[PDB]
Amino acid sequence: XXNXX
Amino acid sequence: PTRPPGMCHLDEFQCQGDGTCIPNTWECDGHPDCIHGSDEHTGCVPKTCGHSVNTCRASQFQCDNGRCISGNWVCDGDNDCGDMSDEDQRHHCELQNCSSTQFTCVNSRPPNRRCIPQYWVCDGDADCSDALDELQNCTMRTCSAGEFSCANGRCVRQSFRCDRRNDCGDYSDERGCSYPPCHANQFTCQNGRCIPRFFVCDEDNDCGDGSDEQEHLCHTPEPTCPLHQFRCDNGHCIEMGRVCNHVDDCSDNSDEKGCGINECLDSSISRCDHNCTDTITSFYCSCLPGYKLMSDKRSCVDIDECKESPQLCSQKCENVVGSYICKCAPGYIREPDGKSCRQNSNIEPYLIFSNRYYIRNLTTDGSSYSLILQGLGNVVALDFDRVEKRLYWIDAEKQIIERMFLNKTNRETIINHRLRRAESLAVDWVSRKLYWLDAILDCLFVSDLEGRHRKMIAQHCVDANNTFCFEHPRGIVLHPQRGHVYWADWGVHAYIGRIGMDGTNKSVIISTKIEWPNAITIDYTNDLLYWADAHLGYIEFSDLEGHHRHTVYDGSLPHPFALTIFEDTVFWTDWNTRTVEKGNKYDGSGRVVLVNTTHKPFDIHVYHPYRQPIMSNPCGTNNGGCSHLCLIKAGGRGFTCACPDDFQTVQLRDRTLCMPMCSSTQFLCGNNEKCIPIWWKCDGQKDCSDGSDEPDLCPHRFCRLGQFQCRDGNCTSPQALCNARQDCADGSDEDRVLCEHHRCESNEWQCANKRCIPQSWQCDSVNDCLDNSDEDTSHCASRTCRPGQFKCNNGRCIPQSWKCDVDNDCGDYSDEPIDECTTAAYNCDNHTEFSCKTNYRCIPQWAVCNGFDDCRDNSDEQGCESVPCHPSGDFRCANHHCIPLRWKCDGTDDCGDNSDEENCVPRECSESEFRCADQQCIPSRWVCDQENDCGDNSDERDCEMKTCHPEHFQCTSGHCVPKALACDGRADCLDASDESACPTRFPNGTYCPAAMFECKNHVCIQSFWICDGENDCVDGSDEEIHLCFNIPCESPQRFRCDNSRCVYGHQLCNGVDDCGDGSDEKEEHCRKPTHKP
Amino acid sequence: PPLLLLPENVRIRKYNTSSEKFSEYLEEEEHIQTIDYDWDPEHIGLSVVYYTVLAQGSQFGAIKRAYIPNFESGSNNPIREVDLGLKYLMQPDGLAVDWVGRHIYWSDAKSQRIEVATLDGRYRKWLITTQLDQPAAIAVNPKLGLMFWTDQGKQPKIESAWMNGEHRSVLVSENLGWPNGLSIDYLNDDRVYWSDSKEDVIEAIKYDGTDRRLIINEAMKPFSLDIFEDKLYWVAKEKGEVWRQNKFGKENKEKVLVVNPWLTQVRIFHQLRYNQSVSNPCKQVCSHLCLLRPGGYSCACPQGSDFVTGSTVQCDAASELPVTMPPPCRCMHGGNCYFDENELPKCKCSSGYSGEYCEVG
Ligand SMILES: *[C@@H]1O[C@H](CO)[C@@H](O[C@@H]2O[C@H](CO)[C@@H](O[C@@H]3O[C@H](CO[C@H]4O[C@H](CO)[C@@H](O)[C@H](O)[C@@H]4O)[C@@H](O)[C@H](O[C@H]4O[C@H](CO)[C@@H](O)[C@H](O)[C@@H]4O)[C@@H]3O)[C@H](O)[C@H]2NC(C)=O)[C@H](O)[C@H]1NC(C)=O
Ligand SMILES: *[C@@H]1O[C@H](CO)[C@@H](O[C@@H]2O[C@H](CO)[C@@H](O[C@@H]3O[C@H](CO[C@H]4O[C@H](CO)[C@@H](O)[C@H](O)[C@@H]4O)[C@@H](O)[C@H](O[C@H]4O[C@H](CO)[C@@H](O)[C@H](O)[C@@H]4O)[C@@H]3O)[C@H](O)[C@H]2NC(C)=O)[C@H](O)[C@H]1NC(C)=O
Ligand SMILES: *[C@@H]1O[C@H](CO)[C@@H](O[C@@H]2O[C@H](CO)[C@@H](O[C@@H]3O[C@H](CO[C@H]4O[C@H](CO)[C@@H](O)[C@H](O)[C@@H]4O)[C@@H](O)[C@H](O[C@H]4O[C@H](CO)[C@@H](O)[C@H](O)[C@@H]4O)[C@@H]3O)[C@H](O)[C@H]2NC(C)=O)[C@H](O)[C@H]1NC(C)=O
Ligand SMILES: *[C@@H]1O[C@H](CO)[C@@H](O[C@@H]2O[C@H](CO)[C@@H](O[C@@H]3O[C@H](CO)[C@@H](O)[C@H](O)[C@@H]3O)[C@H](O)[C@H]2NC(C)=O)[C@H](O)[C@H]1NC(C)=O
Ligand SMILES: *[C@@H]1O[C@H](CO)[C@@H](O[C@@H]2O[C@H](CO)[C@@H](O[C@@H]3O[C@H](CO)[C@@H](O)[C@H](O)[C@@H]3O)[C@H](O)[C@H]2NC(C)=O)[C@H](O)[C@H]1NC(C)=O
Ligand SMILES: *[C@@H]1O[C@H](CO)[C@@H](O[C@@H]2O[C@H](CO)[C@@H](O)[C@H](O)[C@H]2NC(C)=O)[C@H](O)[C@H]1NC(C)=O
Ligand SMILES: *[C@@H]1O[C@H](CO)[C@@H](O[C@@H]2O[C@H](CO)[C@@H](O)[C@H](O)[C@H]2NC(C)=O)[C@H](O)[C@H]1NC(C)=O
Ligand SMILES: *[C@@H]1O[C@H](CO)[C@@H](O)[C@H](O)[C@H]1NC(C)=O
Ligand SMILES: *[C@@H]1O[C@H](CO)[C@@H](O)[C@H](O)[C@H]1NC(C)=O
Ligand SMILES: *[C@H]1O[C@H](CO)[C@H](O)[C@H](O)[C@H]1NC(C)=O
Ligand SMILES: *[C@H]1O[C@H](CO)[C@H](O)[C@H](O)[C@H]1NC(C)=O
Ligand SMILES: *[C@H]1O[C@H](CO)[C@H](O)[C@H](O)[C@H]1NC(C)=O
Ligand SMILES: *[C@H]1O[C@H](CO)[C@H](O)[C@H](O)[C@H]1NC(C)=O
Ligand SMILES: *[C@H]1O[C@H](CO)[C@H](O)[C@H](O)[C@H]1NC(C)=O
Ligand SMILES: [Ca+2]
Ligand SMILES: [Ca+2]
Ligand SMILES: [Ca+2]
Ligand SMILES: [Ca+2]
Ligand SMILES: [Ca+2]
Ligand SMILES: [Ca+2]
Ligand SMILES: [Ca+2]
Ligand SMILES: [Ca+2]
Ligand SMILES: [Ca+2]
Ligand SMILES: [Ca+2]
Ligand SMILES: [Ca+2]
Ligand SMILES: [Ca+2]
Ligand SMILES: [Ca+2]
Ligand SMILES: [Ca+2]
Ligand SMILES: [Ca+2]
Ligand SMILES: [Ca+2]
Ligand SMILES: [Ca+2]
Ligand SMILES: [Ca+2]
Ligand SMILES: [Ca+2]
Ligand SMILES: [Ca+2]
């Protein structure tokens, strides 16, 4: 998603 | 011995006024020694020198409202009383055997369980809750071709299809259905019920969840009558001239009934504590500043200005009755205004923040901007150590944790094994430990600062309802004074956890209004918690127990990931704008963008000796005598021994006893320091301190480092061991002794044949362990799902968030109990989730307008042209979607219509990148690495004329290869130069082991590669025909040609000859010789 | 009469300006950019042309050389090409050959450099590799010891320097669009010419950079220039036609050929164009390279290599032996070429012709 390092 | 920078000795009072150290015994001595009298503070010790009510007849039932009904009609299925008195369970409508035709109609919920006297049992019609009357003692039937055909239920009319009603008795007429949108007359309940507008806010729960009667519509505020008009009794905004004017117009003379003499000149009426305000028609009590109007509307309570509002004073607050005093923590000077605190140590702070590919040194004001390290893989989180001036970090592209002094020397890897995806870390500077989190194993670990003695101290779930479990842990801070570990989590049930530093007393801190808590930190002077949310976009601080939250920034933050606090300014890292910003740590004023970044900055830290306060080590100089981990007990008042991850903790009367218990595939060190995997044994790399890892009787090693070696000399990946598949030639990976005590990690589940599989695939209706042990009914029945996962009657395990998912998960619809899912118990998370319009699904809010049908009815993707994108950190697509600004010009179509990539100006390369020929940036270590990385090998261009990296070996062709790959016995350079110039390995002048063939350019391959038709070793010694003149090949498939070569397989019948005379394409073999006629 | 050379994307075609007919030449090639020739260095009768190639994707560009007949006509001869061994080229938009010595000049456009080496490309070394964006075609004036090169990027410039890389200077930088081709009038006081794909004009200026003049205008997107006798040659890139006009710009635009848009350059094949009579100033004292300069010469080393300490002649780099050239088919006057077991080009004479390689008859 928009929150994966 | 010297006092630490800016502070005083362990026994010395420091004056808040000017920082000079005053003797300890001078504190509270009755004399103001300090320049502002801070040594005689408030907390210093003092000195001492019918016939009746409701009863018409005893044979007539008594309704709760006073009505009288016949008692023989009780529990007949209808509310005869009108207030459910005759059908009330507390009126004995329960626990009794309903008799004869009046079946019990087994069900939990009272209203539909009423024992109606049904005379129509087995008629072929559903008559109560589950319609079990057609199954008590009944007969089967065959469906008519016209009506709906319930499989379990009765064959009923088609009007029952998709109507919010259960008709087959098990909702089978509503399974797979949808709902047309409710009309204007029908208000749509949150769970999907269409209710007419006659029932909205009718003080009755008609939807079944209470949505219709929620306070959003059931407030209806009364008139206020603001200034220039006066309110008397209920909203009468009559003129102030109508006040006590002898005209009764203010309802029932609300103002003429009072309006007497001043009632606060005496205690007979007012009894106000602090002040009086006698005014028109009445009076009201009020309190002096520093006191809060108590709930009884009579008296005053002292405000706790510190705990209630830490914003008032900067660092530390001491409450006093009706006021407050703020003192600065040890090491700070209180400014003459009495509120601001200034750091006293002459060491100046500077931000260390973890960019991708770099560790950076940014000064607080923004004047300087330097590099600490460069050329790293991907640094997702780092943390410093003040005691030794070290610097620890994670490298997600290499799955390692390194360390290095601050003067850039002595770089060293400390952890390389069994680290799947480490999300963050922190350094326990007190008891010398290293804490980190991993997202795949979903656990909290702990290790010695040097890497030895790893342990697991938190797993499964955090709470007594497994409502909060490790799903995606991220961010971790320590409070060694109180012995606590804090860590965030951005799973479905996003929260902030807390635990002691030995595993006990785990708890949940924050569990409301939290969706994406990427970051967390503590201000060690305030003892105030801090965190940021990337979705709701806030920066909230709170007390260490989670109470009294306050907002620094409210929704204006695009996407924070890691924050940090020094003095009074908070620095965070924002991914969407790719910037590091700063501002005041309470209100957020004075916002300043410190620097731009070409890559998203992951972590950040203020490096300063004050950021790790000095305090006494509990395990000091002895480790408490524990031979293993000496952890700090919760509360920071004592220590506690422990054992590593594969030892058994046994307690004696006075000494803990940890002994090894590692598996058959694990090797235990001679001095019993730890256990290492068997494939680590016998490789030359001294993994073990005492040296038992590499004996002199060790057999020769053929495999590269990390690869298990079969007994006959072959190689395989470590996961191939004891996997029930013979992966070696002789199957030494399948030897019984290697598997007898096999074990694997917590996230995989073991089968009967000792191959262990992921726990999600267990009882998944698919045979994985080859033995059908994962799909055995006996185990698939008795097993319990791990904490936090709901269990189906089918045996499958699902995450608890998938109950009431609407979509089937268990296959038997065990995960969709409609009756439970349709009540208030499964509402959407308010102001964090989006509710669908037809179904009862609740989806995360950020899935609205994302190019995918989340609500299963396109509700989430409707009206996408109206949603506003973020004012600062968003890019607006042509199809009205919002994407993070970091994804514009990144080179990938993200919006779905190539809006981001249109008119894309190529970006600039960073300090460690090389600009390709077609204007693209790649890592510098990809230049001349024997691979096409710039799309057209333009990186490989012209490198006979440049040196490589310090740790890389250069081939004669200019390519760079890792040094460790040189002289290993295998061709790695393109021209095999890495082996052509280095000496023999054995005293007898032989190059490689006799169990392999030797090529003349000093690279050795396996025996079977000889005359394989391919130039396996670059010199071509294997392809020399004289070798296989004496070597046979596999006659049934390996075509021994006329000149004794053994061309085979796919290169038979090809387009060109490999034997040299075309016999491998001859129309004698490819053409069917007999083909079994 | 001069012979015209026209390289296309796939084939190279030579056209006689007087016979008005085409003839067969090298075929079966892909993605070539520009050509240049040297007039019979061995004095046998076959001149050597140097055609460079570019490549797409994984494969790199290269430079190759081939023979060309100097007599009236030649056909059916199996012309064989050889790769110079110059690796790491993206696209060689510029390429020139120096007959005074055995050096070759070519600028790799994507590598933003100017590369020189031996005729077989052994002692490679970059001349200048700074302050360039899109290095265009290269011109050389051995008599004055000055080269010419241009850039057609965000800073269109025309520059000249010595053949050893020093004394770099810019001729003009104003009223310039996209230069594409360069040419030098060896007889008119070494006057230089250049084109423009944006301004659509051809301008001339002296070697030092004085008296800039607009010779002709509205040339319909010229690409490359060539000056012979008293006329100027240019080719319309967007149409592929070849035109002639007086080099003084006082004559109508005549039409000669109409070719496909794959045409890249127009080059005149004549000895008088280069005036091979110029002697070599080198004393054969240099170890690896002997570059030219006005009034003398200089020694050079391969790229990234330095002289031996204390000396300015001997290079630390190793010296590699030269590369031989395969023999061509010298069959003359309508002869045919054949290869025996020795693979020697044994010609097959036609009727009425005898002798080795079939001369006269
Ligand atoms: C980059 O920066 C790092 C960190 O500052 C420097 O590393 C330090 O270098 C110094 C000087 O070599 C080291 O000091 C020496 O440490 C030895 C080991 O002491 C251990 O125990 C003490 C006490 O608990 C710890 O403080 C210490 O960390 C060790 O664990 C001592 O035995 C040495 O003693 C000798 O010198 C002292 C005076 O300093 C004399 O009194 C003694 O008689 C004896 O001669 C010495 O003190 C220090 O230990 C290093 N740091 C660490 C953490 O190891 C790098 O030097 C620096 N590199 C560069 C190139 O700048
Ligand atoms: C990695 O895995 C591969 C298989 O993929 C192994 O290949 C085997 O290699 C061994 C030798 O290391 C081969 O053994 C040879 O067998 C010959 C007879 O074949 C029969 O017996 C073997 C088992 O030993 C069966 O596999 C086979 O089906 C037949 O039933 C023997 O004649 C050979 O004797 C050699 O040594 C003696 C004593 O010095 C000499 O007198 C002989 O002249 C000869 O040199 C030998 O024992 C085996 O056939 C191979 N199997 C397969 C299927 O390939 C690799 O060995 C292993 N990696 C390494 C490096 O060992
Ligand atoms: C130069 O020197 C190297 C050694 O440095 C020589 O290589 C050795 O060659 C000998 C002869 O083939 C090898 O000895 C034989 O090894 C067999 C396999 O065992 C090895 O591999 C297993 C794998 O599990 C290890 O456990 C084990 O320790 C060995 O490393 C054995 O099965 C053989 O035993 C059989 O023969 C002997 C007699 O030779 C009998 O006594 C036994 O009962 C049995 O029948 C034998 O031991 C040796 O392993 C090789 N070493 C290596 C490392 O290569 C080169 O041949 C030599 N080169 C030249 C040309 O000078
Ligand atoms: C609301 O209630 C408070 C508290 O009762 C009132 O505060 C009072 O303020 C007066 C005026 O400052 C104080 O009187 C002063 O006392 C000192 C010391 O005795 C004396 O030196 C001065 O000359 C003066 O008399 C009084 O002490 C103080 N009350 C208390 C208990 O502290 C306030 O006036 C009230 N305000 C309203 C609007 O009702
Ligand atoms: C991050 O950046 C800051 C600022 O650029 C660095 O601070 C610098 O640190 C060095 C080493 O301590 C200082 O040099 C030393 O100064 C002291 C005092 O004058 C002197 O006694 C020593 O002999 C030495 O000269 C330097 O002055 C200092 N600069 C500033 C402006 O503070 C810091 O070291 C950087 N950190 C890393 C890890 O790179
Ligand atoms: C943990 O789970 C229990 C149920 O086992 C919760 O107790 C229920 O709480 C809900 C409201 O949250 C009530 O409607 C139920 O009546 C309660 N049932 C029982 C039997 O207690 C408990 O509240 C949960 N823990 C917390 C702190 O919420
Ligand atoms: C274990 O965790 C609980 C919270 O889950 C801690 O209880 C709090 O402790 C603080 C400080 O002692 C009190 O101020 C709070 O009132 C407590 N709250 C609750 C709800 O219990 C408890 O202190 C922790 N125990 C240990 C070992 O530290
Ligand atoms: C970041 O980039 C923007 C746009 O180029 C620029 O205005 C801003 O000044 C940069 N940041 C800083 C702090 O200089
Ligand atoms: C629910 O969300 C609304 C905003 O939609 C907010 O006003 C309210 O405070 C929230 N809390 C509840 C449960 O009402
Ligand atoms: C004095 O002690 C402090 C605290 O341990 C620091 O170590 C400081 O560096 C010391 N000062 C000197 C000059 O050694
Ligand atoms: C102080 O002294 C008095 C006598 O003067 C009493 O002993 C009193 O108990 C003392 N207070 C404390 C706290 O010890
Ligand atoms: C399910 O619960 C039992 C106890 O009732 C055990 O804790 C068991 O380990 C659980 N299941 C799994 C897979 O761990
Ligand atoms: C050689 O090249 C590498 C990669 O660019 C480094 O720049 C290195 O410092 C160079 N080595 C020398 C000695 O200049
Ligand atoms: C190669 O190395 C081995 C190491 O034991 C021996 O020194 C051997 O003599 C070496 N071979 C040569 C030719 O020096
Ligand atoms: Ca005092
Ligand atoms: Ca009843
Ligand atoms: Ca019935
Ligand atoms: Ca229905
Ligand atoms: Ca209602
Ligand atoms: Ca009135
Ligand atoms: Ca107070
Ligand atoms: Ca997970
Ligand atoms: Ca959520
Ligand atoms: Ca956001
Ligand atoms: Ca080892
Ligand atoms: Ca296996
Ligand atoms: Ca399974
Ligand atoms: Ca579901
Ligand atoms: Ca969506
Ligand atoms: Ca994009
Ligand atoms: Ca590469
Ligand atoms: Ca190697
Ligand atoms: Ca081979
Ligand atoms: Ca073949």
Tab-separated table of N, CA and C in Angstrom, chain B residues 87 212 273 396 414 442 489 627 665 741 793 798 844 875 919 941 987 1016 1032:
chain	number	residue	atom	x	y	z
B	87	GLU	N	-44.703	-11.671	28.060
B	87	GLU	CA	-43.641	-12.369	27.348
B	87	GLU	C	-42.265	-12.096	27.942
B	212	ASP	N	-30.390	4.354	13.295
B	212	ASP	CA	-31.475	5.290	13.026
B	212	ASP	C	-31.647	6.301	14.153
B	273	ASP	N	-18.839	29.592	46.583
B	273	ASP	CA	-17.548	29.464	47.253
B	273	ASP	C	-16.697	30.713	47.071
B	396	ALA	N	17.438	-2.927	5.219
B	396	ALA	CA	16.375	-3.818	4.767
B	396	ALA	C	16.708	-4.555	3.479
B	414	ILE	N	26.551	-7.041	13.059
B	414	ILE	CA	26.380	-7.752	14.321
B	414	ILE	C	25.275	-8.796	14.224
B	442	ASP	N	6.366	-11.072	13.554
B	442	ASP	CA	5.446	-10.315	14.400
B	442	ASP	C	5.789	-10.497	15.876
B	489	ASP	N	1.867	0.215	16.045
B	489	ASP	CA	1.392	-0.815	15.137
B	489	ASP	C	0.318	-0.216	14.246
B	627	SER	N	24.252	-15.877	34.066
B	627	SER	CA	25.173	-16.268	33.003
B	627	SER	C	24.668	-15.824	31.639
B	665	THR	N	18.999	-30.225	13.621
B	665	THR	CA	19.630	-29.414	12.589
B	665	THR	C	20.301	-28.165	13.144
B	741	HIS	N	14.596	-34.552	15.528
B	741	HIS	CA	14.205	-33.486	16.439
B	741	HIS	C	14.120	-32.155	15.705
B	793	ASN	N	-16.051	-23.199	11.835
B	793	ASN	CA	-16.438	-24.584	12.084
B	793	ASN	C	-15.789	-25.523	11.077
B	798	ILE	N	-8.899	-17.459	10.340
B	798	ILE	CA	-8.904	-16.167	9.653
B	798	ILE	C	-8.625	-15.068	10.656
B	844	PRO	N	-11.469	0.310	5.373
B	844	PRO	CA	-10.605	1.417	5.792
B	844	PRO	C	-10.816	2.631	4.903
B	875	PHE	N	-0.921	14.902	-5.289
B	875	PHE	CA	-0.989	15.218	-6.704
B	875	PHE	C	-2.319	14.727	-7.255
B	919	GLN	N	18.876	9.086	-19.162
B	919	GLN	CA	18.504	9.906	-18.015
B	919	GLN	C	17.749	9.108	-16.962
B	941	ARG	N	29.599	0.859	-19.931
B	941	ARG	CA	30.362	1.521	-20.977
B	941	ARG	C	31.692	2.035	-20.448
B	987	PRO	N	49.035	-29.036	-0.810
B	987	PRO	CA	50.499	-29.170	-0.887
B	987	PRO	C	50.988	-30.005	-2.056
B	1016	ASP	N	31.148	-24.614	-20.118
B	1016	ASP	CA	30.880	-24.336	-18.709
B	1016	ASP	C	32.019	-23.554	-18.065
B	1032	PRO	N	31.536	-42.483	-21.124
B	1032	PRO	CA	30.250	-42.745	-21.775
B	1032	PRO	C	29.200	-41.729	-21.356
